[PDB]
Amino acid sequence: FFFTLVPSTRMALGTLALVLALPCISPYVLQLLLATLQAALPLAGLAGRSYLLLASVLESLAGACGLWLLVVERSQAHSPGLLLLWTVAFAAENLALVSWNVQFSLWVLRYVVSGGLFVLGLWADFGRKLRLLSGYLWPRGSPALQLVVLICLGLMGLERALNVLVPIFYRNIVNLLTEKATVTSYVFLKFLQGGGTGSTGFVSNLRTFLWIRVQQFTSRRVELLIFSHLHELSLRWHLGRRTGEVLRIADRGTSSVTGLLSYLVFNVIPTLADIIIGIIYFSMFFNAWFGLIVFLCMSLYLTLTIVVTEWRTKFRRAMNTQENATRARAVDSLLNFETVKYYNAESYEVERYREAIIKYQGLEWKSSASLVLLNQTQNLVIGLGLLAGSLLCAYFVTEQKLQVGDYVLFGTYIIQLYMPLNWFGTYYRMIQTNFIDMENMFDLLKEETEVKDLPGAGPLRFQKGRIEFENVHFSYADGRETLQDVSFTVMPGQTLALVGPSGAGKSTILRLLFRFYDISSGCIRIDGQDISQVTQASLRSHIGVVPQDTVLFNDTIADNIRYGRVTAGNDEVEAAAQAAGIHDAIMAFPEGYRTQVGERGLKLSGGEKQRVAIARTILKAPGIILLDEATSALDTSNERAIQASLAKVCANRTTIVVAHRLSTVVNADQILVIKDGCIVERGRHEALLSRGGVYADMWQLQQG
Amino acid sequence: FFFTLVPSTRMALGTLALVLALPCISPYVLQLLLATLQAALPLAGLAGRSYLLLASVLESLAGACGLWLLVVERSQAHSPGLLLLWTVAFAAENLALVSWNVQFSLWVLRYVVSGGLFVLGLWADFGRKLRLLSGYLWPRGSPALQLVVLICLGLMGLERALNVLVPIFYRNIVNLLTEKATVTSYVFLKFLQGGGTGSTGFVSNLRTFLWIRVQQFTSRRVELLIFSHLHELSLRWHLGRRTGEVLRIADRGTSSVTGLLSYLVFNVIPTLADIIIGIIYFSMFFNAWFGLIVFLCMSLYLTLTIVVTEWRTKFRRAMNTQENATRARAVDSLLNFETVKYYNAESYEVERYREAIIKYQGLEWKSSASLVLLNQTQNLVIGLGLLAGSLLCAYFVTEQKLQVGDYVLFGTYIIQLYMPLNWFGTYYRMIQTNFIDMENMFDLLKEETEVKDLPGAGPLRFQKGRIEFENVHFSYADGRETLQDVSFTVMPGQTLALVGPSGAGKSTILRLLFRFYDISSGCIRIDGQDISQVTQASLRSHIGVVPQDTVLFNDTIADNIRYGRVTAGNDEVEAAAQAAGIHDAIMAFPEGYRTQVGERGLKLSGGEKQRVAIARTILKAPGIILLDEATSALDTSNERAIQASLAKVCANRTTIVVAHRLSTVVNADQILVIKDGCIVERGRHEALLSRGGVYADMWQLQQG
């Protein structure tokens, strides 16, 4: 009787008013008809009208009006289907009326049940490893995710507890079936069966659902750590490595961390804890040889799965090598179609390719048959363990020395213990692959620098822009002298122009002004102070180097300009684009001031790429200028335009230029050619032409 | 009593004499000690010595001597460990002696058991689809594999029979547990439990083991069929396609056929047959609403798994697109390390890359949470179906209107029915991928030719080698005239040399002598008969064309020479190598006469590659010669050597040469230049020099 009112209260409590707050013609009239029928049913209940009747009428009145509001709010433009389904599910009390075979309530219930049906129808060392990983499970200094880690370990402790405790309740169910040979207490056991067996995979899903956010934070932390640490400078270590393997080992390391911690806390610790707690549960059930023979079963299954996966891996390697060989022979016979047609190997090459197919497919049969013998001897000893355990329990129940009828517990319990063991055994090759993915990343975490930030690293006192060199040296190898004993002092507002030999000594000198490399001896100073005692970022924040190339990331053009200095608004972007003059290219381009460029976006011409580069350096606004002028010259409008923009960025600036062109070198303050690790001549253009040094030879080279 | 003798007979029958035939110091002395102890045990049994005693002594004598033979045969240089293990396993009868707590037998058994323990220790439209696939399950005309297909369908019918029938025997086991509340008949049920539950995965492994050889024959048949059919000639269809996609669609089609027939006969037909036979088993058990609610369970699980895999696939596509975008931005920020260091984006690019990582990882959380909601609502309605079914069976057993105690059958049977349903539901995307892999292959099976073998295709009456052209035309497109109205008759033992324009008209003319292409009109005949009425292979078996390039397959050099004609022995290979003169290169190469060459083997120089090509054509031995002389000339020793080998293969032969060199054209019978689809001049070298045609212009071009 009260169960119907409780079910009505539970149905009426489907967050009707609560959700209605939270979520904020013929079909609308059909809903208004249901709301009219619900108002009529509630007015019929009020007309029929004790506290249950008044509470029913109150629930009916609120639910009915909520239907009108829900329908009207959809007109002002899922959950109603859930409400109607939950209500129609609660209407299964009807059978309790039929069980009788007062009246006004039956008519009201019959009218309600029809009105709901209408609503639903209308709605339609390993110590170092463990210490480092226990540190790797610690996010940060914030109290909102350590609590979630506590939830994860709490459900992890709950899962094996329920996983061992609910087959005992199944045993209680069948035992009480024998002892009643009661329905109410049997239903109070069956509810534990329902909410227990509908909870194993459910609690595994909740575990993995919070494990997702655990992996989110850990992957963020390790990926940003290694991405910061691969942005240190060791260029000889850099350039021999391609970018693809360098970031592939990083992705393998973060998925190594993910798979490693998730599997070692999800399928290694819990299955060993499950086996241990099963044997100890038997040790509090009955201390006998049963735990020993079941322990023999699980250990034997583990050992055979490991050793036949070790049998599997060599067959997989041989099968991979044979399929690579046959597909290579196939495509390389297909490559020269014309000589395959020139000879009458039309019926021969199919025979030799079929021979290679047979030679691969035999090893394919061997590998798949090894899988067959794995699963075969596996299920054979599983059947033998079930047979031995089931016979010893059968002997026990027919001898009645323990509690009887419990054979279903020991029957399903071996299968339930075994079900994670192959789930482990398929990942023995995987955990060692995770180890070799994480160990190289651990080596990569903490390696080295090439330029070393000495203590006392301070700011760069940008007084005037006066750069002096004093008997300096350099090596990128042993005895490697691309630069040897040069010395100068370049002044503010003046310009050095540099030609070198056919070699990267010019760019190397440009990089050691930048301190992109190191010096073995000598003295390089900027504005009085040595370049090596200071912070690198405060050194290179006052430096603008024009590169000969120009990268274009897959992004838009205002972000590409703000790549010069990211603290800009769009006003300085447009002002720098009008300073360079490349804003008219943005007029010629579609997207306003956000033209998507790069590798897949909108491409560019080479002088315009250098115009985007010089616009980036214009936005960056240093005082120290270092141009890398291309040997690839352009049209004289493009040539004098890039020289005029170089003038507009270089006027009254401390400017240092490497170049091989004419207009740059016919006007500068001093022209230097630096070949074989030394300055080979010094002087202006008129000085080199009046002394006739190697500038005469390179004058013949620029002539032709 | 007799069980011990039967076990002794079964142990003695471990194929001791049978295998010993089939398979054909301190450890040897240890085995001789065991054989001496076994001779002593058998002599003790003969000394103790009725028919069982004489049969035991006979088994002991044969087994003992087999141990001496097995040990000695290993000295004359696994199974002995199996024999000793099977024997020591049979020695578990010992407990039957202990059960007593005659004598000579006990001492003999005690001495035997010790002797075995020593041996073991010492040893250590879909209608068209179904019709075509039912044809695709038919191998050939041989009676040894259709029988295996009958075995496959027999075990397939056996598997569902046992899979439904053995939980009824589990129900019999627990029912007889209740009705004995007998041990011998209960063991005669428990043996069915053992040999039945140790047979489900076992018969699945035997099925898949013979399915392996089924896949072997079907993959051989379909791969060789499509490999023959991709070796037809449609060159405009050929050249636009790369080899990799052409063979990748073939590998996808054969694995499509494999996965398609194996899954549609293994996880679609049997699981539907299992559901149907479960409901019909209930229909012969009790015809009620139980079959309807279980049918509701299985259908609801199927529908939700399908629709949330359809929910899954768009999340997988979006997650793939986002991970491609983030990894592309990451590697393209890493590409220009020097500008990343030139600007102070060292702390900015890590922030923008972390922003992209967050933007991808949110969709990663959404996809993995979609997997969570899949498994969650899955296990939720599985628990609801278990709850409804288990409660209705609980109501039935507490009301006793059926056979009681059967609740374990309906308990495990829903799980056992369900266990293949997700095994199907994970392959809904896979079967449609198999369909799109097989349909294009079906289109590729039967397409077309470009040169059509007309009926009346006969041999090539190789009388003299006289080739005539009569107002001929050609097109590889619409209105495409690289050749238009040329006509000649080249004689036996004489030589035409051909120069063309900067275009492939020369090679195209060379290919239409070969009938590599088709003609729109005209008349091309060889030795009186038209080239188009005949078989292609009998046309191109009397033709040797020197190609400008030379393919080298990943194989050895005698097979590379026998690529000219595969019917050769090694005598003609060596004779042709001495005819060309490239056998001294085989002397310079390591492997005798089998030097492994190709892409991974031993490489070559270009003139020597052409020497291997001309050795192939020398071995092929035609009369019709067609040289494709390279424009890339070599050293004058190499040049006059390849011209001298061309002379040695071309002397008194019907020879046609395309060339651009000098020594070929200063001696030939007639020199033709064919530009813009016409012969532009005719005559010998002295004729072109005495009339001064375009040979004057190309004389200036060869001069410089």
UniProtKB/Swiss-Prot annotation, chains A, B:
Keywords in alphabetical order: ATP-binding, Cell membrane, Disease variant, Disulfide bond, Dyskeratosis congenita, Endoplasmic reticulum, Endosome, Glycoprotein, Golgi apparatus, Lysosome, Membrane, Microphthalmia, Mitochondrion, Mitochondrion outer membrane, Nucleotide-binding, Secreted, Translocase, Transmembrane, Transmembrane helix, Transport
Gene Ontology BP term (one): heme metabolic process
Segments on the Cytoplasmic side according to the record's topology features: 190-252, 296-376, 428-704
Lumenal side: 169-175, 274, 398-406
A cellular-component GO term for this protein: mitochondrion
Resulting phenotype, residue 688 to V: In MCOPCB7; hypomorphic mutation
EC code: 7.6.2.5
Residues covered by the ABC transporter domain: 467-701
Gene Ontology MF term list: ABC-type heme transporter activity; ABC-type transporter activity; ATP binding; ATP hydrolysis activity; efflux transmembrane transporter activity; heme binding; tetrapyrrole binding
Residue ranges of every copy of the ABC transmembrane type-1 domain listed in the record: 149-433
Residues annotated as transmembrane: 1-21, 28-48, 52-72, 80-100, 104-124, 148-168, 176-189, 253-273, 275-295, 377-397, 407-427
Effect listed in the UniProt record for changing residue 65 to A: Increases migration in the absence of DTT. Reduces migration in with the presence of DTT
Phenotype for residue 506 to M: Does not affect subcellular location in early melanosome and lysosome. Does not rescue the normal amyloid fibril formation and normal maturation of pigmented melanosomes. Does not influence trafficking of melanosomal proteins
Reported effect, residue 554 to Q: Does not affect N-glycosylation. Does not affect N-glycosylation. Does not affect trafficking from endoplasmic reticulum
Phenotype when changing residue 558 to T: May be a modifier of disease severity in porphyria patients; loss of expression
Stretch list, region Required for the lysosomal targeting: 1-123
Record annotation: effect of changing residue 24 to A: Increases migration in the absence of DTT. Reduces migration in with the presence of DTT
Role this protein plays: ATP-dependent transporter that catalyzes the transport of a broad-spectrum of porphyrins from the cytoplasm to the extracellular space through the plasma membrane or into the vesicle lumen. May also function as an ATP-dependent importer of porphyrins from the cytoplasm into the mitochondria, in turn may participate in the de novo heme biosynthesis regulation and in the coordination of heme and iron homeostasis during phenylhydrazine stress. May also play a key role in the early steps of melanogenesis producing PMEL amyloid fibrils.
Family membership noted in the UniProt record: Belongs to the ABC transporter superfamily. ABCB family. Heavy Metal importer (TC 3.A.1.210) subfamily.
Name used for this protein in its record: ATP-binding cassette sub-family B member 6
